[PDB]
Enzyme design. Structure first.
Site, PDB file in Angstrom:
ATOM      1  N   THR B  89       4.945  -5.918   2.340  1.00  0.00           N
ATOM      2  CA  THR B  89       4.393  -4.783   1.609  1.00  0.00           C
ATOM      3  C   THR B  89       5.413  -3.661   1.465  1.00  0.00           C
ATOM      4  OG1 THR B  89       2.163  -5.329   2.377  1.00  0.00           O
ATOM      5  CG2 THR B  89       2.529  -3.098   1.559  1.00  0.00           C
ATOM      6  N   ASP B 386       2.386 -12.972  11.051  1.00  0.00           N
ATOM      7  CA  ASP B 386       3.157 -11.740  10.938  1.00  0.00           C
ATOM      8  C   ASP B 386       3.538 -11.182  12.303  1.00  0.00           C
ATOM      9  OD1 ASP B 386       2.946 -11.959   8.215  1.00  0.00           O
ATOM     10  OD2 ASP B 386       1.350 -10.466   8.008  1.00  0.00           O
TER      11      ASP B 386
END
Lengths: 550, 520, 527, 51
Positions: B89, B386
């Site tokens: 992101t 992640d």
């Protein structure tokens, strides 16, 4: 520029489309020429910018090469296919000057079409181009410069940076210069009894997006893109003198020849026949394992049946790969490629001479892709380049950016004579042809004078894409080159000029020798010859005839 | 007409403006997906499923964006995931702002793109040195230090409530796959999920979890020391590559054909009984005739197994895959198996293989997860990928970069100081890079609900005097230091954010014209 | 917060509006002017060819000059309308060289094509044309020689200038008889006031062109010829021409008047009263002795019945443009009151005869030495030839029309454009700047007029221009191309002359038309 | 041209989190100071308006 179309005559009838004659054909030829020409005008020069093309499937292509751009454009105009195939011919033979030959041939058609309306005959126009080209080639031989008093590889480093310009690798061309020069020197071979030649595409291009482009590693050896057959095999081989086996024979359960039909009258024979089908393959792999081969390359897939013995013997298995890739592996490591395993005698055997030699064989994982890195080859050296970028579309441009840089350096070592680039030759050929044809004169003087100004499209287009003043730079290129053409080869000064100019970055006239921008003499020749044949073929066409498809 | 071309050709400066506006809209959607207070985005696929996540990687992957320039921003999501897996992101937001902040010009100044590109290459080199100076190394052998490091990516996710439990699952998963440099890969990490249950009850269990019940009722479901042997070949009767085509002259020959098929399979079962394996795993299907002779000797039969699971079973028990039954030996038999049990769950059966835990090949392990639904399982699985990827950077790169937006703001301060010393024509493209670096910490303020004018003004002033660890607090929206904040992020994540965003911006600046629908 | 569903983006301009900017828009604007020029290139020169154009109404019109050619076709693209404005402005102001103005205006845009492909923006290109057009006009005034210096005749001056405009038309072979007409047509008009409505030519289908006649009188043709016609003599000796703006009718165009009569005997008076009112105006005409009666409004039956016994000719329904042409040659002017007619308002003439041509009868006024007007009756096989010769003589009379105001001798046939171009090249050598290439391109663009002269003649244009520049090296003037002798030479000995208003307006219109389009880099078309 | 650039320079202001309420007060106070400084820069005062 064509209006009102054309009035169809009933006394003239032919099957298919209508027949158009007169000046309308040459007007549509130039109109179709300027269509493909304006596309490559903005992509020329370090200040130029490439274009994007959509494949209608959502995928696009970003490349600065004019050959790929014209290849993706399918031209329905009959004369338009000549310039499209001209770019595919340019990069295939020389490998450079792809954008220039399209723009040069476009201006030749625009000026000659204006001369046809002047009432001079096209053959006289063509004669003026061919006579001026014969003397222009003689001037190229006079401006040749042989590399002398140069330190190390700086000669090839400065020339390689010229092809790297105008492309995404131009900013990184300082780091990429040493990778391209060392890549073609490692694949150096010998043929024609003493003649030095280099393979094309021999340097492997691997695409892994990550980190930065300046961190791209140059592997001292060949790299192959493949996935390991069994994950239980070791990915790193320790110790020197690693034996590589290049084989075209797959290890699989195979059906007997279709011309054979097995008919058995006993049930007891079903055990030995079914076992022998897998046993025939065992005889070939058994003699290879006993030879101590660490890595076994195979052209076709290998079933898990024979992959069991590779794990116990700690042998790394390989599956389907490109056929042309396995040839340079055996030549570099010393192995001999075997299409079918056989011996002169009627008995099967395996010789140790078919195994290669290298320092080590390792499998490195770049991002999520895994590839084999073969370093320290024995018989012949090799090299590979792994390109890194932000996305896969940038890697597609860096491949053609790297492939074009390999063709310029390839033609550099074939002929030691080089010429300065950056619009220096196009500005020098203008004045040389201005004094030319003044002795002959008569009618051919006008056609030759337009051929000299036709080469001015290259230096003028470069200044347009730089958002600078073109008339200021063009007037300077004509100032230094013109007065020095009459110089006598003593008292010096004089010809020390005219050898440099047209620097797009600083917008000033600087020496190309100290700048480093150079071009091989091979890229200059055959570029005007191919552009001439494209101009002669289109100019000679008075009438275009189109037949409707059936 | 001519070829395939024309329609409306966008030329001039408006072609680059359309490339900047379209790429800017990519980062505006996930603009709220950055920070610990980040919201969620629900995606609707044409297949009929549902994808709800705050990760910009999965959001930009399923969304179909048709545009030449805007699709290049979609490819940057897999650049951060495949190389690292954390910060997807941040890269899209940074690269989206760089194109807008670093190149508003050519709408005004009419500066050539390559001139700006030459300044971006020098700005990327100086940005790496600033990150290296503000990065303090951390010990990789400290368990307490790795727990707070994994929580970095957890603080922006929904599992932050379980972060105390989540760091236990991510630390043991990376350490087990790590092989002694210390290269690990997620292909051996199992993503298999259990529907329902309590998140606190989920734990990482060594071995491979199979969904298949035992084939025969007399097969023992409880074994103290299981011995596993892998077979790629099916236990059924192999027809062969070529047709047999037996010509039967006498009636006694046909019964022998069917009699050998029972004895031929029996011959392969007797060779298996030589090593007396307690559990036999076959990659392909198995006949009901072969299971009897294996049950008489104590062998266990299972359903056909995919090739992906065969590699993980061989790593846990140390077994070697043996295709040929005649070549089977005691050396390739797997040992040191802790426990074999089968638990009942309404959806499917589950078979457990435990490792005795006591250099060799890397061990394999599976991660069990108990969620509240099927979609919650997929969200935590993306959170584990992640979180576990953070531990891979610290082991290969012991350097530790500042987090909480302190990395991007520290570079913006150094670029502004060298912008006045450089002068030249490149001062505008070089100084404009610092304006794009401060947008990432500015997003943390907009999501927290604070005033970015007063906070970023004091952040730049306290950065020079106070320390290089000063950053924006996510929860309180105040000015705090990363030393007392207790959370840090590896340098590899910050290096991939700066490199990928700048290298991608140079590609879009070189676009001149755009032609759509040429051909296929 | 949104209203519902999704909201699409709003396009700034209205949907369907074509807008494009940059250097590509100017090239598209220049190619629009060059494509129009391609049709007018072969038309330039005495050997030029006519263009046949059929409109959407299937109305055949043939015109050699570029003024009418651009009027037939409907021009859409804006830049192509610029060449139409310069053709109509050149036609109304002068009328000669309307094709050459379009050739020069489009050639300046053609020579600016390689300049726009360079880094030179269009603003600096217009500066060279604006500077060169000021010096080019001053060169024409220096090459003009006054005709009164040689003390020659004024009649022969207008004859040589009229034969120049007769080129490229159908008159070139017949110019012997036809030039002697238009030259005598301008001399009848006053030197202070020259009018193009008085020289108006009637279209008479049929006949031969060499059968045309020129008489100082006029012809009003005819409309109805009511009862009493064809009895009246059509040949008069010395008639008295009378014209009336009042309408002679019995309660026709007059507004409705309600008449209420309460007696039978009084009703007989109002019936005979209308007979007395109409015959009162008719009796007052006979008292003046007018043998010809003309009127704009129709003539009643009783009128023509009254003049039938008196042989007086009367024809009504004549247009106002024709009556205004009659009142000048007849002396005194229309009196719309029959009782106010005075003897000095009547006209006269030496001879009057009405003859029929092409199945149409025309009243011809003859023997009017004091007539300040003139008429032209043209004939021909095709009806398109008549419209071509009428427009040919129209532009030919404009040559002798503008010559009487200002008398200046200017070279023609490529002689002027080559002399001015060399003077600009010597001035461009001292510029040493961006204008050096623009002035050299401007001087080269002026050579386009001699180009179509040799190209339409069949000879090569390369060898001719080479002989010009070698000849123009030494001081020369009027030196140009000659079609008859096939060799280029002095046009002053050929006697072909041209007015100064043709060359001055051609340079100013071409520069104004070129700088207008080059200053527009974006074109927006709505709807 | 001037009104179009005032919206272009506000692109950075809004991106920094500056609300449109304080933006209006910024241009209003700057416009009053602009009109007051234009009088001292006039060297072309002329009382003729005739010749």
């Amino acid at each position: 520029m064509s209006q009102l179309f054309n009035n169809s005559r009933s006394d003239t009838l032919f099957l298919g489309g209508e027949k158009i004659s007169g000046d309308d054909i040459r007007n549509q030829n130039v109109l179709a020429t300027m269509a493909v020409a304006n596309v490559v005008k903005s992509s020329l020069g370090p200040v130029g910018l490439d274009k994007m093309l959509v494949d209608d499937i959502g995928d696009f292509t970003v490349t600065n090469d004019g050959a790929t751009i014209l290849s993706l454009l399918d031209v329905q105009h009959p004369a338009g296919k000549i310039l499209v195939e001209l770019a595919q011919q340019q990069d295939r033979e020389i490998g450079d000057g792809t954008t220039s030959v399209v723009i040069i041939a476009s201006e030749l058609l625009k000026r000659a079409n204006e001369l046809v309306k002047n009432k001079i005959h096209p053959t006289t126009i063509i004669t003026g181009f061919r006579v001026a080209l014969r003397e222009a080639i003689r001037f190229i031989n006079e401006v040749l410069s042989t590399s002398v008093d140069t330190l190390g590889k700086e000669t090839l480093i400065n020339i390689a940076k010229t092809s790297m310009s105008s492309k995404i690798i131009g900013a990184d061309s300082d780091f990429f210069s040493n990778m391209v020069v060392d890549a073609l020197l490692a694949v150096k071979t010998q043929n024609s009894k003493g003649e030095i030649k280099y393979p094309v595409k021999a340097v492997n291009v691997l695409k892994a997006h990550g980190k930065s482009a300046t961190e791209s590693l140059l592997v001292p050896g060949y790299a192959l893109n493949c996935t390991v057959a069994s994950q239980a095999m070791p990915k790193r081989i320790a110790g020197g003198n690693v034996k590589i086996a290049c084989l075209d024979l797959n290890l699989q359960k195979a059906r007997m020849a279709m011309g054979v039909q097995i008919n058995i009258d006993d049930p007891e024979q079903l055990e030995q026949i079914r076992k022998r089908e897998a046993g025939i393959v065992l005889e070939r792999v058994k003699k290879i394992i006993d030879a101590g081969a660490q890595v076994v390359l195979t052209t076709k897939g290998i079933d898990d049946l024979c992959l069991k013995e590779f794990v116990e013997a700690k042998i790394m298995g390989v599956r389907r790969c490109k056929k042309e890739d396995l040839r340079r592996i055996a030549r570099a490591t010393g192995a001999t490629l075997v299409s079918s395993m056989s011996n002169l005698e009627g008995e099967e055997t395996f010789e140790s001479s078919y195994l290669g030699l290298c320092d080590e064989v390792v499998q490195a994982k770049f991002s999520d892709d895994e590839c084999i890195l073969i370093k320290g080859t024995s018989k012949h050296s090799s090299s590979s380049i792994i390109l890194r970028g932000a996305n896969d579309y940038s890697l597609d441009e860096m491949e053609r950016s790297l492939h074009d840089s390999l063709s310029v350096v390839k033609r550099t070592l074939e002929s030691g004579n080089v010429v300065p680039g950056g619009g220096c030759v196009e500005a020098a050929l203008n004045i040389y042809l201005d004094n030319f044809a003044t002795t002959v004169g008569s009618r051919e003087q006008l056609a030759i004078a337009e051929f000299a100004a036709a080469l001015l499209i290259i230096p003028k287009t470069l200044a347009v894409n730089a958002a600078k003043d073109s008339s200021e730079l063009v007037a300077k290129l004509r100032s230094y080159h013109a007065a020095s053409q009459m110089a006598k080869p003593e008292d010096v000064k004089r010809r020390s000029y005219r050898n440099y100019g047209l620097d797009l970055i600083r917008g000033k006239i600087v020496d190309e020798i100290h700048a480093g921008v150079l071009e091989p003499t091979i890229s200059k020749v055959k570029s005007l010859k191919s552009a001439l044949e494209a101009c002669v073929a289109i100019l000679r066409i008075d009438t275009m005839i189109t037949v409707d498809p059936e | 007409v001519f070829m395939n071309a024309s329609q409306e050709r966008t030329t001039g400066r408006q072609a680059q403006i359309s490339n900047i506006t379209a790429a800017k809209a990519v980062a505006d959607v996930i603009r709220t997906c950055l920070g610990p207070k980040a919201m969620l985005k629900m995606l609707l696929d044409p297949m009929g499923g549902l994808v709800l996540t705050n990760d910009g990687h999965a959001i930009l992957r399923e969304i179909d964006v048709a545009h030449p320039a805007a699709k290049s921003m979609l490819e940057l999501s897999r650049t951060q995931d495949e190389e690292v897996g954390d910060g997807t992101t941040t890269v899209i937001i940074l690269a989206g702002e760089i194109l807008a902040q670093c190149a508003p010009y050519l709408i005004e100044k009419n500066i050539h793109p390559v001139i700006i590109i030459q300044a971006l290459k020098k700005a990327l080199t100086d940005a790496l040195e600033v990150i290296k100076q503000v990065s303090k190394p951390v010990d990789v052998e400290n368990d307490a230090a790795m727990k707070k490091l994994i929580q970095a990516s957890i603080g922006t996710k929904y599992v932050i409530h379980w972060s105390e439990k989540m760091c236990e699952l991510a630390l043991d998963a990376v350490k087990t796959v790590r092989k002694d440099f210390e290269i690990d890969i997620k292909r051996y990490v199992r993503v298999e999920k259990i529907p329902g249950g309590d998140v606190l009850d989920s734990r990482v269990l060594k071995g491979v979890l199979l969904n298949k019940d035992v084939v025969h009722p007399k097969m023992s479901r409880h074994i103290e020391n299981p011995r596993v042997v892998l077979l790629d070949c099916p236990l059924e009767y192999k027809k062969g590559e070529s047709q047999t085509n037996i010509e039967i002259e006498k009636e006694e020959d046909w019964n022998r054909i069917l009699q050998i098929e029972e004895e031929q399979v029996q011959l392969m079962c007797e060779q298996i009984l030589a090593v007396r394996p307690t559990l036999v795993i076959t990659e392909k299907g198995v006949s009901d005739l072969a299971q009897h002779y294996l049950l008489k000797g104590g062998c266990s039969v299972l359903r056909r197994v995919k090739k992906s699971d065969n590699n993980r079973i061989a790593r846990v028990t140390g077994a070697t895959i043996v295709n040929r039954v005649e070549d089977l030996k005691e050396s390739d038999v797997g040992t040191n198996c802790g426990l074999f049990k089968v638990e009942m769950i309404g959806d499917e059966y589950f078979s457990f293989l435990d490792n005795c835990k006591e250099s060799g090949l890397q061990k394999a392990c599976t991660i069990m997860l108990r969620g509240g639904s099927k979609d919650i399982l997929n969200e935590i699985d993306r959170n584990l990928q992640d979180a576990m990827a953070v531990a891979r950077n610290v082991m290969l790169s012991p350097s530790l970069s500042p987090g909480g937006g302190a990395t991007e703001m520290a570079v913006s301060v150094k670029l502004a100081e060298k912008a006045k010393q450089l002068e030249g024509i490149q001062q505008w493209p070089y100084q404009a890079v610092a304006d794009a670096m401060e947008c990432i910490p500015r997003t943390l303020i907009q999501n927290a609900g604070g005033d970015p004018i007063r906070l970023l003004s004091q952040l730049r002033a306290k950065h020079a005097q106070g320390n290089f660890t000063t950053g924006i607090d996510g929860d309180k929206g105040k000015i705090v230091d990363m030393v007392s904040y207790g959370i840090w992020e590896p340098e590899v994540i910050k290096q991939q954010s700066v490199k990928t965003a700048i290298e991608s911006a140079c590609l879009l600046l070189r676009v001149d014209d755009i032609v759509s629908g040429v051909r296929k | 917060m949104n209203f519902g569903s999704q909201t699409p983006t709003i396009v700034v301009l209205k949907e369907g509006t074509d807008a494009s900017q940059g250097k590509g828009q100017i090239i598209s604007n220049i190619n629009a002017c060059v494509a129009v020029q391609e049709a007018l290139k072969p038309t330039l020169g005495p050997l030029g060819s006519d263009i046949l154009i059929v409109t959407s109404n299937q109305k055949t019109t043939i015109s050699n000059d570029g003024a009418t050619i651009l009027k037939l076709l409907d021009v859409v693209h804006p830049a192509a309308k610029t060449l139409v404005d310069i053709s109509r402005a050149q036609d109304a102001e002068v009328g000669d060289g309307t094709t050459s103005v379009t050739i020069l205006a489009g050639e300046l845009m053609k020579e600016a094509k390689p300049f726009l492909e360079e880094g030179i923006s269009s603003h600096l290109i217009m500066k060279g044309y604006r500077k060169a057009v000021s010096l080019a006009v001053e060169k024409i005034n220096e090459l003009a020689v006054d005709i009164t210096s040689e003390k020659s005749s004024g009649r022969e001056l207008l004859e040589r200038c009229a034969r120049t405009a007769m080129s490229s038309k159908l008159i070139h072979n017949n110019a012997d008889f036809f030039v002697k007409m238009c030259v005598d047509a301008v001399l009848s008009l006053d030197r202070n006031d020259l009018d193009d409505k008085l020289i108006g030519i009637k279209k008479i289908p049929g006949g031969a062109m060499e059968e045309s006649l020129f008489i100082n009188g006029v012809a009003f043709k005819k409309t109805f010829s009511y009862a009493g016609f064809e009895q009246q003599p059509k040949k008069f000796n010395n008639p008295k021409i009378l014209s009336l703006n009042v309408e002679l009718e019995l309660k026709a165009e007059k507004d409705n008047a309600e008449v209420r009569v309460e007696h039978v005997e009084d009703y007989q008076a109002i019936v005979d009263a209308e007979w007395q009112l109409i015959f009162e105006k008719l009796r007052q005409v006979e008292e003046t002795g007018a043998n010809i009666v003309l009127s704009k409004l129709p003539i009643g039956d009783l009128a023509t019945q009254f003049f039938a016994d008196r042989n007086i000719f009367c024809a009504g329904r004549v247009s106002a443009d024709d009556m205004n042409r009659v009142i000048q040659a007849v002396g005194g002017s229309i009196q719309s009151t029959t009782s106010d007619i005075k003897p000095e308002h009547l006209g006269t003439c030496a001879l009057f005869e009405e003859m029929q041509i092409g199945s149409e009868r025309y009243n011809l006024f003859q023997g009017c030495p004091q007539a300040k007007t003139c008429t032209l009756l043209l004939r021909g096989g095709a009806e398109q030839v008549i419209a071509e010769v009428e427009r040919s003589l129209h532009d030919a009379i404009m040559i002798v029309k503008r010559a009487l105001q200002n008398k200046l001798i200017v070279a023609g046939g490529g002689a002027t454009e080559m002399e001015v171009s060399k003077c600009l090249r010597d001035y461009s050598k001292t510029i040493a700047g961006k204008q050096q290439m623009i002035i050299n391109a401007f001087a080269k663009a002026l050579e386009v007029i001699p180009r179509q002269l040799c190209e339409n003649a069949g000879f090569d244009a390369i060898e001719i221009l080479n002989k010009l520049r070698l000849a123009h090296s030494k001081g020369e003037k009027w030196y140009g191309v000659v079609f008859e002798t096939e060799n280029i030479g002095d046009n002053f000995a050929k006697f072909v002359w041209e007015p100064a208003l043709v060359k001055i307006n051609a340079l100013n219109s071409a520069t104004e038309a070129t700088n207008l389009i080059l200053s527009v880099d974006e074109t927006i078309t709505n709807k | 041209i001037l009104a179009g650039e005032l919206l272009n320079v506000s692109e950075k202001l809004i991106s920094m989190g500056l609300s449109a309420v304080e933006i209006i007060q910024g241009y209003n106070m700057a416009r009053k100071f602009t009109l007051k400084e234009l009088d001292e820069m006039v060297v072309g005062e002329i009382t003729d308006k005739n010749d």
